[PDB]
């Protein structure tokens, strides 16, 4: 750049992508000779699915295929290279950074936000854990186009503050993970984008995953759609500059599977950290199915984000990682369930409620 | 509570509908096959040249009680009830009780507003009223419309389009005020009963409770039932439940000039891009180039209608999802009805 009137996130990303060319072309993977995947493909085609699928089996990519259009106006078809707005699934990225910071001894999950983010003052103290678990009592984040960066968003949330009746009760809230993203920035003294790339993106070779405004990936960024009235209409993201950590990231389904399988293989943490993070629920440490941006459930682990006409959903266990990205708004959950439970027949015990995982 | 007063007395003292599906007819076999393999949860009804050629339920009406969707299942039509309200409006115009270009204040004296809003601007969704925000507090239509009066007009939206349930709530009250009778009574006496709609009901009518579908939406952490909690204040803008068959029965009969003469019905149904009918939208529904459309999305349900002079396709979905892609695929791809129907600008006879 030049004059640099940019947030820390863009500063980092612009400099990072000065000499970066467009990412490598990804090929379709689909073996019609395997009845499972033939059944899936056939289902996705006849159900008029518009988006992309990626399925990993015992760590290997066994299916990767795009259906319908990435951009309906320009006639660009969905390919394996198509990157979808993952929305609330970015909370997993932020959770991983949190866990990393805990093991680096830079934060403690039961310490309050005010400790790491002095200006974030609140009627009562809020431990980092209560943000992470969506039980802080903060009013639901009301986005604004005014907000140019993460700082303004979290400084807006601080003004709105606590809702007494909802204190120490569960309430899903993007705002929680926006505050956590700022905590990450404040303790590290570095942008969220930098923390993500240095600590996750690059180590795990996620080369088809990008923040909304990165230049070399614009070619592949999917457009989301909804019918409310007057036809199929494109829902332009207008607030992703203030949404660092709670859903301004774009991923190919393959990269999402690549991320999860590598974490499953202990590439970010040791087994004693990874196993409970991924599988322990109903315990003092991991009281809910939800933790660090994702769900550990009885038969499966789940990620999901719904944002600007897109739906990005992940069902997985130790054999399959199923990533289903939808850029025309609709019911993605019925689809991914049908694939995971009905076709792949994975409706079976996976995690055990109450057990202290080793 | 004039609406319930009428309905309770009406219902002091419905027939089972059978499946209609001929797998030997390739069109309908293709539709059924699509609906099954796409995991459709709801009900379909298709009329061909006035006759019911397909009527079938898929998946569950109530997932908790294991009740399957049948042709008897009645779905929350939501914003498609605006069509009912529009029909009542048009009826009142032809009875010479209201004029569409006269202001609301004329017929509803207490509904005062910084600038006058003609009935037409409400009907067309261009009143400039701030988008209705409901509340559980409101026990009836009156409180809802007295709430919307309170907040008034939004400058800049003064005379431009903005979809708003509130518009048709104020029109429903206009109907009540001019007739001196409840909306429910006006609907039954002027539409429901004349057109033998016997599997259509307001949310709280007792004899139909058995068949009222539950809407769902897995937002996070499983499939969850979205209980309607505001339908007492939503008379005219989406508190009605219909079987898909009744919706087709309604449209085909209107098409056959059973509510109005052809000189009234034809433009109502087909004229768009004119002084009288400037937009595709009118009286609660859309007249488009290749088709006429109704749609309502409310409490986890989606109720959509595509039709022309041959087919009326009614598709009801009680697990929230993309109903439009489905009904398009049926109407355009399978039934091959993507072809000129209404003509923009033409003054229709």
From Swiss-Prot, chain B:
| Claim: Signal is one of the keywords in the record | yes
Q: Which UniProt keywords apply?
A: Antibiotic resistance, Cell membrane, Cell wall biogenesis/degradation, Hydrolase, Membrane, Signal
Tell me which EC number(s) this protein carries.
Answer: 3.1.1.103
The reaction(s) annotated as catalysed by this protein in its Swiss-Prot or TrEMBL entry are: [(4-D-Ala)-(2-GlcNAc)-Rib-ol-P]n-[Gro-P]m-beta-D-ManNAc-(1->4)-alpha-D-GlcNAc-P-peptidoglycan + n H2O = [(2-GlcNAc)-Rib-ol-P]n-[Gro-P]m-beta-D-ManNAc-(1->4)-alpha-D-GlcNAc-P-peptidoglycan + n D-alanine
Pfam families named among the record's database cross-references: Beta-lactamase
List residues traversing the bilayer.
none
Primary location recorded for the protein, binned into one broad class: membrane
State what induces this protein: Transcription is dose dependently increased by the addition of beta-lactam antibiotics, fosfomycin, and bacitracin.
One GO cellular component this record assigns the protein to is: plasma membrane
Where is this protein localized, as stated in its record? Cell membrane
Membrane topology annotation: Peripheral membrane protein
SUPFAM superfamilies hit by this protein: beta-lactamase/transpeptidase-like
Please give one Gene Ontology molecular function term for this protein: hydrolase activity
Q: What does this protein do?
A: Catalyzes the liberation of D-alanyl moieties present on wall teichoic acid (WTA) and lipoteichoic acid (LTA). Affects the methicillin resistance level and autolysis in the presence of Triton X-100 as well as the cell wall structure.
Quote additional remarks. Answer: Inactivation of fmtA results in reduction of the methicillin resistance and in a modification of the cell wall structure.
The molecule here is called Teichoic acid D-alanine hydrolase
Q: Which species is the source of this protein? A: Staphylococcus aureus
């Amino acid at each position: 750049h030049k004059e640099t009137k940019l947030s820390d996130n863009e500063k980092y990303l612009v400099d990072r992508n000065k000499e970066k060319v467009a990412p490598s072309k990804l090929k379709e993977v689909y073996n019609s000779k395997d009845p499972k995947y033939k059944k899936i493909d056939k289902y996705l085609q006849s159900s008029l699915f518009n988006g992309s699928v990626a399925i990993y089996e015992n760590g290997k990519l066994k299916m990767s295929k795009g259906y319908g259009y990435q951009d309906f106006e320009k006639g660009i078809k969905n390919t394996p290279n198509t990157m979808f707005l993952i929305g609330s699934a970015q909370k997993f990225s932020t959770g991983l950074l949190l866990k990393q910071l805990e093991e680096e001894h830079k934060i403690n999950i039961n310490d309050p936000v005010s400790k790491y983010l002095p200006w974030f003052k609140t009627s009562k103290p809020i431990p980092l854990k209560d943000l992470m678990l969506h039980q802080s009592g903060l009013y639901k984040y009301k986005s604004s186009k005014d907000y140019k960066n993460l700082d303004q968003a979290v400084k807006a949330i601080q003004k709105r503050g606590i809702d007494p009746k909802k204190y120490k009760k569960h309430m899903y809230n993007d705002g929680n993970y926006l505050v956590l993203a700022k905590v990450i920035e404040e303790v590290t003294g570095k942008s969220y984008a930098e923390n993500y790339y240095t600590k996750i993106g690059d180590p795990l070779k996620l080369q088809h995953t990008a923040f909304y405004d990165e230049q070399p990936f614009k070619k592949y960024l999917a457009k989301g759609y909804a019918y409310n009235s007057t036809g199929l209409s494109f829902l332009r993201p207008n607030i992703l500059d203030q949404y660092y950590g709670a859903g301004n990231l774009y991923m190919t389904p393959t990269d999402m599977g690549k991320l999860i399988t590598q974490i499953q293989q202990y590439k970010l943490f040791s087994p004693k950290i990874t196993n409970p993070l991924l599988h322990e629920f109903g315990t003092k440490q991991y009281p809910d199915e939800y933790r660090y941006g994702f769900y550990a459930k009885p038969t499966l682990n789940r990620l999901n984000g719904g944002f600007f006409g897109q739906v990005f959903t992940v069902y997985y266990n130790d054999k399959y990682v199923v990533v289903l990205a939808l850029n025309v708004k609709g019911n993605n959950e019925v689809r991914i369930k049908h694939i995971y439970n009905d076709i792949l027949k994975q409706n079976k015990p996976y995690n055990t409620k109450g057990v202290i995982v080793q």
